Symmetry: C6
Subunit: 180 residues, 6 copies
């Protein structure tokens, strides 16, 4: 509604960039994450628990959840605006919705980025994971599928999300120096 140049151009383009990466290239990279997960063992069920332990949620599913979460505040505004428009036919209020929506986008973007770091150590996928969860005997060596390609796409998504955080913080800074 009252977006700046970066609000409606550099934020909408980067959002489409993230979706395009997810659906065109990234999704099929993760297609055989479990199928080509190879563990050096003869113990039945060891592969299931080790993959589940080291990948509690896939990266692409986490990114899909993140994109769904950061697009919801914009969607809520587009229905509140279309509702107040018809209600009158039957600033101030609009300002508080647009400032909170930016605030919620920053929180959602930072929360998922924090989840990525805590759950997956850093941002580089390792070739070998060592697993001692039951029923694997002692420690079992398992090997990840396409660790390098997944690292490349992880860096792309994290870097763009970090840029989107900065582009949202500046808009909050601009809106919080005039009003207050």
């Amino acid at each position: 509604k009252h977006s700046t140049s970066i609000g409606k151009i550099w934020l909408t383009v980067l959002f489409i960039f993230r979706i395009m990466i997810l659906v065109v290239a990234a999704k099929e990279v993760w297609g055989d994450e479990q199928a080509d997960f190879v563990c050096n063992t003869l113990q039945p069920g060891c592969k299931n628990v080790c993959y589940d332990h080291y990948f509690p949620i896939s990266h692409i599913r986490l990114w899909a959840l993140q994109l769904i979460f950061v697009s919801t505040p914009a969607l809520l505004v587009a229905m509140h605006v279309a509702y107040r428009r018809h209600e009158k036919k039957r600033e101030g209020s609009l300002w508080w919705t647009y400032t909170s929506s930016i605030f919620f986008r920053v929180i959602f973007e930072a929360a998922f980025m924090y989840v990525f770091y805590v759950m997956y150590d850093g941002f580089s996928m390792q070739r070998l994971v060592k697993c001692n969860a039951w029923p694997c005997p002692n420690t079992v060596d398992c090997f990840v599928s396409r660790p390098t390609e997944k690292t490349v796409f992880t860096v792309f998504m994290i870097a763009v999300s970090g840029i989107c955080i900065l582009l949202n913080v500046t808009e909050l800074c601009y809106l919080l120096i005039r009003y207050c």
Copy 2:
């Protein structure tokens, strides 16, 4: 027709949220539920009956049935309204359809949530299931595919359904304090 702000915004957004989770992320998590179901046994047919025993209906199929059921009352209203519109050209009556439709949505939402709890104990998927159905000899250990990721998506869908119940109860409360 006579919806409040939460009726046409917070209820329609949450409904789209559930569909987006189901088709974009959740469905492929359950892609190999039976293909990667691994049992420690040499008995033919044991894997078929143990998977069937512990998963009488898949979670995503239950969620798809729930969404189809909770969207039907809205669909029925949108056809009754378009029918009465042309019938006159050839409140009161509309009020009773909109109050019952909300009532049926609450019952449908609560019924499926109850089915989820009774059928699947709690809301967390276990890594190991112990099965003694014929023809499995004694008790056979079987291992579930992606139990943690399925648990995460189960919590998401249950929480949103619980919120949707509250958003529907308040609208019934508002409509049942003015008329009665």
Copy 3:
């Protein structure tokens, strides 16, 4: 054309209900019907003939044929009406087409329901099928994939088809008490 409330609302909603069940949930339930059909034998070709014997046509293919058959009479009417409209530009006749179309819909619905019962005994799929067709030696035990989930969807489709029969019979009753 001259449909009642149940003719254009409760019949069109149920028809869409059946299609949504078929394409969104049911079809992938039957995805691995033969792939996970497991027989306890070492005889080549035994699995092929036993599956063919017990599933001469898949449930979803029978339902797809049923929906195609019960939608043609309506499609024929919508083209006859659009043809008579332009022919004049270049009741009575329309009444006989709409009464026969309902009649054919009832026959098609009842015929497929009868085919379901005769071919598949009841409406519950069994876990074990015993097969003695050549080249299987003596009697061979075979195990069905997802028997419980298939039973659940079978009951849903049969119940809705039975309701659709009743909704079509009443319209025939209403049209056959005024004219005759």
Copy 4:
């Protein structure tokens, strides 16, 4: 252009019927025609040549070719009409195109039906085929996937094609009793 009731209603509906069967139900029946083709032998390459010998072209591909061939004469007319319309802006001639198009449809329909009979003996798929093509040693037993379901759909397609031939012959009879 100058079609009768059966020309534009009963012929167009049956054509959509054939396409609907092909794409919705029939295509996935033939999905594992070679994958589940099982031969009782240890000879490498025997399965490839026996399947190729007994299925020189799949039924669904033959039906797809038939539908493409019987729809081209109508497509050619729809471009000739749109070409003569603009040419004048820049009967007799139209009659000869519409009579030949019906004639070519009958020939194409009968040619493919004749191909089906000659290539595949009758219209019922057998469970067992005996194959002695090199490099199979002596005669090798092979087993077809879903022979009964394929027979059911073969009968449907042949019966509808036979009806379409009759519906096209009558139109030729009507056009060949007035002009000649």
Copy 5:
């Protein structure tokens, strides 16, 4: 722009015919070209190099490249025409673009047909290929998947391409007897 009857009817219909064959029937025929390529050997890597040696590019990929290549000259004209239209608002020139576009279509059609012959000997696929490329020991027998069905579709595409060449040559003949 200045096309004859065969230019805009018989050439556009045949082009759609080739696309329809490619996407509806032909593409799935080549679905398991390498998966069902069977060689009589125990040498790892032998199957990879023999399939690559005998199929440097798949037939459907070659046909897709042909259709893409023979469609750009028409696409280039449709953008040059829309560019000159707006440029004036801001014959002779159009004639030279339409004559060269037909010329390039003939060259592209003939080049790919020549590539098909040189690369694949004739137009019939053989059941057996004998391969001696490293690391295969001596000569290894390998067997092609669906050779007869692929031969049938190869003949269809070659015959239509030959017809399209003749339809393009006549238009060049007509355009080169009036101007010169």
Copy 6:
């Protein structure tokens, strides 16, 4: 906005050419890149690390990233233009956006072409790769799937990208001889 003939015709046609190659033919040439990657070894995990070592990112994913990157500058301009249009309603500036966009396209095109050369040596895929990464014992022979077909498509994409660089350099040359 101020594009020449080559800017809006020969550059947009080549861009569509690259997308058509990628989605219609190229993507499923790379469909089984890892599935048919065959290594001569019995060491678990050896295949995973050798494929990852020699294919850090798939060619099609690199091309998809390249197309996304070289289409962003045009997308940014189309939103800046639509933003300045409405801002006035509420040359010079447009010139600097269109000149930088061409500049960024050249850099992005050259950067990815350089990445292709450095990462993959030349532009021809080899049949055999020798791999000594842990845990592979000594040096292990591995064999690539469809090396010749991938080489053919690699040459096509490199040649078109090189042409696109030249078409973009000339436009920069034309714009940098009038202004400067």
